[PDB]
Structure formats: C-alpha cells, structure tokens
Amino acid sequence: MKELFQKIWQNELQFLNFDAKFQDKSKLDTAECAIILSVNKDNYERYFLLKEFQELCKKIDLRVDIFSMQNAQICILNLFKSGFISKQDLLKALKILEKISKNTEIFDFILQEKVQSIDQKALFQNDFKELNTINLELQKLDENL
Amino acid sequence: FDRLLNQFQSYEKHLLLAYENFLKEIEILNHQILEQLKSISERISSEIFASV
Amino acid sequence: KIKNELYKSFEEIKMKLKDFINILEREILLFKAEFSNIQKDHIFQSDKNFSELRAFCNASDEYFLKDFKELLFKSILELDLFFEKLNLKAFTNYENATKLSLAFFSRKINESRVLYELDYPKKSEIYERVLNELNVYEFETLLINKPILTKIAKNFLEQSQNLIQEKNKFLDLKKAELQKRRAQILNVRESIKEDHH
Amino acid sequence: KIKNELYKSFEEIKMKLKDFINILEREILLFKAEFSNIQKDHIFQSDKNFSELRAFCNASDEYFLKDFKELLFKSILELDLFFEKLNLKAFTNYENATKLSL
C-alpha cells in the first residue's frame, strides 16, 4: 500500500514504517478512523487549522503534523486488515465524509482488499472465560466480597 | 534527543553482537581460499608428473 | 568454479556490511521524518524553538548518516581490490604457473642429463614450485598472517564506533543548550516559591 | 620509473574529478549557509514560510550533493581497478614474461 500512500500524499509523503504502531487497538471509533483516513494531502492544511479536528486529535492522542497523520492512517489500515475492526460501515462513513473530502483512492483500497478471518464469537468466549477465571481467583482471596 | 542517542547505542550493541559470527566467518573464508589454492597447486603438480 | 565460489563469498561479506549501514539509515530517516514536522501544542510554547528543532531534524541525514556511508564505500573498495589481487595473481595465472614450473623442471632434467660422467623430479618439489608460482606465500601471508578481510572488518567496526561517539558528543551539545533553558526556568520557579521571605 | 609515472597520471585524473565535485560542493554549501538563516523583514511576512525555507536549505546537502559524491566514488573505484589490472598483468609480470618467452 506504499503506492496508495504515494497516491494520496504525492509530494508531502514522508519516510514511514508500514505497520500498526497502535497502542490500545480501541483508541478511536470507526467514524473517527474514517475522518483520519480523509486527511488527504489536499485537505490537510484546512483540517489541521480546524478547531474541531484539533479537539478530535487531542481526544485520540495525535498531533496535527503530517508524519503522525500518515502513521496513524497506516495503523488504521493495518488494523482494518489484521484485527479486522472495520466493516463496509467504514466505507459507509467515508462516503458520508465525501461531503468534505473526495477521498476515492482510500475508499477503493478498502473496498478491494482481502479482508481477514473474523473469529468473533470464539474471542468473546475466550475473553468471558478469562474474566470468569479472574473472578474465581478473586473469590479465593472477605465473605461479603 | 535521548531517543536518538538510545537508537545509536542500540545500533552499536547490534554491531558488537553480529561481529562475533562475522569475524569467524571471515576467518573461515580465509582458510577456504588458501586450501582452494593448495588444491589447485596439488592438481597442477600431479599433472606435471604425468608429463614426465 | 572455485573462482566463482570465492567471488560469491566476497559479495556476501560486502552485502553484510551494506546491511549494517542500511539498518542505521532506516532508523535515522525515521527519526528525520518524525521530527522535521513536530508542531507546538498550545500558546507560550516558543514557536522558534520548534522551528529550529524541525530544521535540525530535517538536516539529520547530513548530520548522522553520510560518514557511515563513506566508511562503507572505502571498505568495499579495499575488498574489491583484494579480490582483484587474488584473481590476477592466482586464479588467472595458473596457466602461466604451469608453463613456468614445467619448463623449469624440463631444464633441470636436461641439466641432470648433461652429467655424462656416470658419476630426477620428485612430486613434493613440483608441488612447492607450483605453489611458489601461484604466489601462495604472499597469499598465505595476506590470508592468515595478516588477514586482510579481518583487518577490513575491524577497520569498519572501530571507525563506526568512533563515528557513534562523535555523534553522541554532538548531541550532548544540544542537551546542554536545553539544560541552560531548563535551569533558567527552575531559577524563576524557585524565586517564586521562596518569596515567602 | 615508468610505473610510478603512470601511477601519478592516474592520481592526476582522480584529482581532477575530485576538484569538479569540490567546486559544486563549495557552491552548494554556501547556498545552505546563507539560506538556513534567512529571517523575515516585515510584520506581515509569513514566519512559517521562512521557517520552512530555513529547514529546506539546511537539508540541501542531502538534496543536492550526495549523489554526485557517490558517482565520484564509483568512478574512482573503477579507475583504481583498471590501474591494478595494468600493474599486475604488465608492470610487475615483466620478469615472468621474460622467463616465458626466453
């Protein structure tokens, strides 16, 4: 997807490592991810000067610098691939946002990309029985608790 | 600035690690070159004997 | 085939050195990309400070990378010249060595014959003579006594360590400047906090 | 004596190439030194514009100089290899040539 990032950041593209540097994996919801993806090199100055975008990035723990924007886009796309957080609803949100940002390339890439294994209910059962085990351990070590 | 310095130190540490294998490989190659030379010379000294 | 094998080995060594430099380069360029654009968050954060930091990190290739590249190029040059020497004195001149040693033994044989007073080649002698013609004393010295490849590798390692040290000193200058600012700020804070006097 | 003369000539050629690169380098570094520090004159002038110019001109080594140096190094490598070839097949193997033809 280096070709994609060259497409959307033609000359202001920076030297960056294509993997999800993400620290929390729940750092931002899908609409906020779509907003971050729509920071194409043609809208980027306006977005950075916009107070509401600055508030959003302070909520997410981002800067308004170009490099960190592109790095966050990378991480979002890798989570879209691997951890498979986004549905076609991400594509919905980008179509919604196209009021402002005519971001066709990222939209097409999200559309035509082998998605991943989904594996939801197994993960649910694993996490829930993790929590059950933690509850049991707490019960081991007071009667009211 | 501390990050940059730490990166430099990490690079130095990695180099120091890798040179352990690297120098011994180079030594091996030295020995290999010499033995290839000696094998060539043995073949030629065999065939000079034919030639008698 | 032997010559091709040795050429491949030489290539391997050069490739390893190149990989080292590439590792360092990747890290440094990531640093440059991050910090050429860092922008102050909220007013009172000294716009000029951030601008100068951005410029410095932009120039960081020149600052931290190019000397390593030059060192790598020098080492590669020396390696290539050594392979050239090994090729042209041994792995091409074997025909010449054969002709010279063979003719020498021929002349020795005829000298033996010219003793018509009734009062000839050993294999060990032939081996030693062919070894001498192939310059294998010189290449023994350059391969084992004073190993050339090993010397090159140590040159690379020692000079890269020197470069790292120089870079560290250079960065210590920047940290000292920052410390000046910090000390000024702390002086103001302690002045405010000790006005209960 | 002949071999030393040829070695000196080879050195001369390499030196000329180096001088060319040094000329270019001198000009490029003067540009960098001048324009890494240009500061706005007037109230209404774009501080950010000037800052970005300063950073770019500071990066001008990477931008304009290093490729030329790499090219110069390539050329020097090839020249040295050619001199080594001429040395080791002719200006040292004259003894061997004499013995063989004789």
Residue numbers in the entry:
A (entry chain A): 1 to 141, 144 to 147
B (entry chain C): 305 to 356
C (entry chain C): 408 to 526, 534 to 611
D (entry chain D): 408 to 509
What wording appears in the published article?
Here we structurally and biochemically characterise the DLP pair from Campylobacter jejuni. The respective proteins, here called Cj-DLP1 (84.5 kDa) and Cj-DLP2 (71.2 kDa), were cloned, expressed and purified. Both DLPs are monomeric in solution and form a stable heterotypic tetramer, termed Cj-DLP1/2tetramer, with 2:2 stoichiometry when mixed. The tetramer is dominated by a 2-fold symmetry where Cj-DLP2 with its symmetry mate (termed Cj-DLP2α and Cj-DLP2β) form a central back-to-back cis dimer flanked on each side by Cj-DLP1 (termed Cj-DLP1α and Cj-DLP1β). Combined with GTPase activity and lipid binding, we present a mechanism for how the tetramer tethers and bridges distantly opposing membranes.
